[PDB]
Amino acid sequence: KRPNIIFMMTDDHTTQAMSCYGGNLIQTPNMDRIANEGIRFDNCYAVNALSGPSRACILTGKFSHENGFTDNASTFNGDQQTFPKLLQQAGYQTAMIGKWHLISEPQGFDHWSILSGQHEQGDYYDPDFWEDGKHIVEKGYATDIITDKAINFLENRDKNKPFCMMYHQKAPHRNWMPAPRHLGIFNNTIFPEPANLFDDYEGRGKAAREQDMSIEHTLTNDWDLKLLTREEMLKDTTNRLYSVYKRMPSEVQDKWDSAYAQRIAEYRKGDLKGKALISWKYQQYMRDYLATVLAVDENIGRLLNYLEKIGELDNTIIVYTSDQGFFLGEHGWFDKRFMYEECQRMPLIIRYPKAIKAGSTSSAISMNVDFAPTFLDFAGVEVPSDIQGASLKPVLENEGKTPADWRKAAYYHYYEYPAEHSVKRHYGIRTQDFKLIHFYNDIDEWEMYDMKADPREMNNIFGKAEYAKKQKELMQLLEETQKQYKDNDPDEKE
Ligand SMILES: O=S(=O)(O)N[C@@H]1[C@@H](O)[C@H](O)[C@@H](COS(=O)(=O)O)O[C@@H]1O
Ligand SMILES: [Ca+2]
Numbered sequence: 001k002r003p004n005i006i007f008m009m010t011d012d013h014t015t016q017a018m019s020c021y022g023g024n025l026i027q028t029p030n031m032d033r034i035a036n037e038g039i040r041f042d043n044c045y046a047v048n049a050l051s052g053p054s055r056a057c058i059l060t061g062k063f064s065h066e067n068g069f070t071d072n073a074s075t076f077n078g079d080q081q082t083f084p085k086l087l088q089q090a091g092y093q094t095a096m097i098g099k100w101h102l103i104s105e106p107q108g109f110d111h112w113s114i115l116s117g118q119h120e121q122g123d124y125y126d127p128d129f130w131e132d133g134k135h136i137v138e139k140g141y142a143t144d145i146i147t148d149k150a151i152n153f154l155e156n157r158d159k160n161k162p163f164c165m166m167y168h169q170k171a172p173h174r175n176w177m178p179a180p181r182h183l184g185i186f187n188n189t190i191f192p193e194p195a196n197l198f199d200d201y202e203g204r205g206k207a208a209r210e211q212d213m214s215i216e217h218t219l220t221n222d223w224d225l226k227l228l229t230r231e232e233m234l235k236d237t238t239n240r241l242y243s244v245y246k247r248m249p250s251e252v253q254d255k256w257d258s259a260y261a262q263r264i265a266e267y268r269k270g271d272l273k274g275k276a277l278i279s280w281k282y283q284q285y286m287r288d289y290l291a292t293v294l295a296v297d298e299n300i301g302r303l304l305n306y307l308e309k310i311g312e313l314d315n316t317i318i319v320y321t322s323d324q325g326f327f328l329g330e331h332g333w334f335d336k337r338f339m340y341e342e343c344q345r346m347p348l349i350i351r352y353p354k355a356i357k358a359g360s361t362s363s364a365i366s367m368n369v370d371f372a373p374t375f376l377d378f379a380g381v382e383v384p385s386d387i388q389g390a391s392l393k394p395v396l397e398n399e400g401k402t403p404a405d406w407r408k409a410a411y412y413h414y415y416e417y418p419a420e421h422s423v424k425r426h427y428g429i430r431t432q433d434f435k436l437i438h439f440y441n442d443i444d445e446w447e448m449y450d451m452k453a454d455p456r457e458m459n460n461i462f463g464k465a466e467y468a469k470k471q472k473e474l475m476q477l478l479e480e481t482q483k484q485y486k487d488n489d490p491d492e493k494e
Pocket of ligand 2: 010011012050051173323324
């Protein structure tokens with residue numbers, strides 16, 4: 001009678017690249033099936049928009065200052081409480097397959113197979129895995145391999161125990177190497193630009209101006225844009241693009257070279273400069289990012305079809321999300337980290353027909369700390385008091401409606417600075433209609449956005465007289481929220 005769980009999570013996917021979220025860029029039919037047969041959350045947020053921290057928050061139901069894992073230079077204390085351990089005590093068989101990114105050996109999993117290359121980022125081709133204590137190499141393409149490993153786990157499971165499987169893809173993380181069948185697929189496709197692709201940061205503070213995550217300056221010609229021929233790579237085999245290209249089979253290298261020849265010729269013509277060059281880089285980025293997404297959605301389909309074939313689709317809570325969202329050129333950026341909406345907001349779609357009316361939507365403000373208590377609640381396990389999120393069951397079971405007692409803000413705290421991409425440390429709250437942010441290291445600057453009037457977050461209204469009352473109310477809610485979640489020294493002074 002207890003439901004199975006499959007928790008499907010990508011790395012750096014985002015709502016703009018999902019058709020169920022009204023995106024124009026790509027159709028995602030299998031993700032959309034989950035939404036159309038289930039519920040779509042419009043206001044689910046990561047509490048620290050970085051991979052390792054998000055994964056730690058998901059396992060523990062706790063904010064980063066409680067779970068210990070504040071940045072991608074942390075090691076997860078595996079002795080702490082996590083939902084898979086609790087499910088395993090309750091009689092579930094548990095599995096972890098794909099991107100782990102928590103460094104310590106997984107605990108609470110009957111079976112685990114985790115990407116070990118690139119310091120646990122994984123490789124796209126011929127990925128290394130650490131699997132139940134041993135190193136292996138899997139031939140092929142990661143997005144497909146991870147799905148085959150998931151199916152193999154399910155085929156070989158103890159069919160007298162319910163299962164909980166965490167299925168964690170590498171795609172679509174940088175540097176966006178598509179599957180062989182998708183190489184070159186968007187070479188003749190032009191994607192619409194966001195209206196703020198050329199953002200000059202008027203109306204923002206120092207943090208937006210001082211980042212290093214731009215289309216214009218940060219994307220590299222080799223690793224990101226793929227602008228080397230085979231001949232060029234073979235002359236310098238220490239090249240980082242070559243380090244990942246060389247993992248592809250010969251026939252895939254041939255297809256890659258054919259797929260990128262046009263792009264290389266366009267770059268070598270030497271006529272692209274300034275805004276035109278930024279626009280061209282944007283197209284190349286989107287073509288690679290979106291081509292990489294295609295295999296993710298195909299593989300979700302394979303899992304949905306497998307579950308249906310074995311008669312377990314309706315008896316399984318099916319979740320799809322991404323560790324955080326991602327900038328697809330908005331504000332001129334790629335990457336995450338900021339509390340801005342594109343990357344703070346996680347996709348969250350859930351199918352479970354017993355509980356969830358098909359085609360439901362929710363605006364209930366939800367966080368990645370809510371996943372753990374939701375799974376424990378549906379598994380009939382008492383939710384321990386130290387979990388900081390809340391079960392989503394009351395939302396799920398009432399067509400997505402927001403309970404009267406539901407929280408009024410999502411809380412956010414990002415720590416990783418100085419570091420890659422140079423995003424200042426900050427914390428804040430997102431209410432239904434507003435956002436309040438404090439950047440506190442190595443600047444001291446507040447920002448505030450009216451999300452209904454300014455959904456693209458272009459106009460910092462902090463300190464503007466007409467918002468004085470609202471600003472005070474948001475300050476007060478921020479302080480209450482910090483106290484509630486025990487973030488007692490949020491500026492890290494003591
Ligand atoms: O040149 S790369 O090495 O590709 N650079 C990427 C960054 O662009 C990315 O922000 C981090 C963290 O990403 S996370 O999703 O793991 O948090 O991972 C790598 O270091
Ligand atoms: Ca990520």
